[PDB]
Structures are given as structure tokens and as C-alpha cells.
Amino acid sequence: VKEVLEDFAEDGEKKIKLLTGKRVQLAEDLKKVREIQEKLDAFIEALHQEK
Amino acid sequence: VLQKDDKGIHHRKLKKSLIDMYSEVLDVLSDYDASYNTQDHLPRVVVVGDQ
């Protein structure tokens, strides 16, 4: 079983064989949207006077 | 009309020295409430001495 679960470790598809993957995609999207807005905030502060 | 004398470019930023701007900060606190109860909130320098 440890060997089989290592083979599970190796293959990511074998983790999303059943297409219920909302967990991982949603987590990634949340983190990336936070980065998007964090950079846009400083950019817009630069728009207010840095022009 | 006075600032137009300076001809300060829109894209440069840092239009005024920070302390000149803090003077307006202290002035607005004084205008909102001239009592010491509101003066206490921000730094000041008092010049006091014998006549």
C-alpha cells in the first residue's frame, strides 16, 4: 500500500481521475487574484500622482 | 497660478516636502478642534522661555 500510494504521489492525473477538482483550482485562483489586486493597488496609487 | 510658476511636471510625484504637508495636517487638526484634547494626537515642537 505504501508503494501504491507512492505511485499515487507520482501521477497528478491519478489524483484528478474523477473530475471533482474544484478544490485545487479554486485555491489557486484565490491566491492569484489576491496577487492581481495587490499589484493593481500600487499601480493605481502610482496613477494618482506618478502619472 | 502660483504653482504654475514652479511648472512641476504631472509625472514626477513628491510635489511637496513631507513636512510642508504635515503642516497642513496639524492645521486641520487645529481647525477641527483647537483644544489640547485634539492637539495631543500628533507631534509638535513648543518654543517656550522666559520673557
Residue of A28, A3, A24 whose CA lies nearest to A13: A24
* Sequence letter at residue B2: L
* Dist. CA A3–CA A13, nearest whole Å: 17
Chain A contact present for B11, CB below 8 A: yes
CA distance A12 to chain B (A): 49
Distance of CA A46 to the CA centre of its chain: 27
Matching residue, cell 513631507? B18
Please indicate the experimental technique that yielded this structure: cryo-EM
What resolution in angstroms does the PDB record give? Answer: 9.7
Q: Cα separations (Å) of B24 from A20, B21, B27, B30, B41? A: 58, 5, 5, 10, 15
Q: Mark yes or no for CB contact A51/B10 under 8 Å.
A: yes
* Dist. CA A28–CA A16, nearest whole Å: 15
Mark B15-48 as b/e (b = at least 16 C-beta within 10 Å).
eeeeeeeeeeeeeebeeeeeeeeeeeeeeeeeee
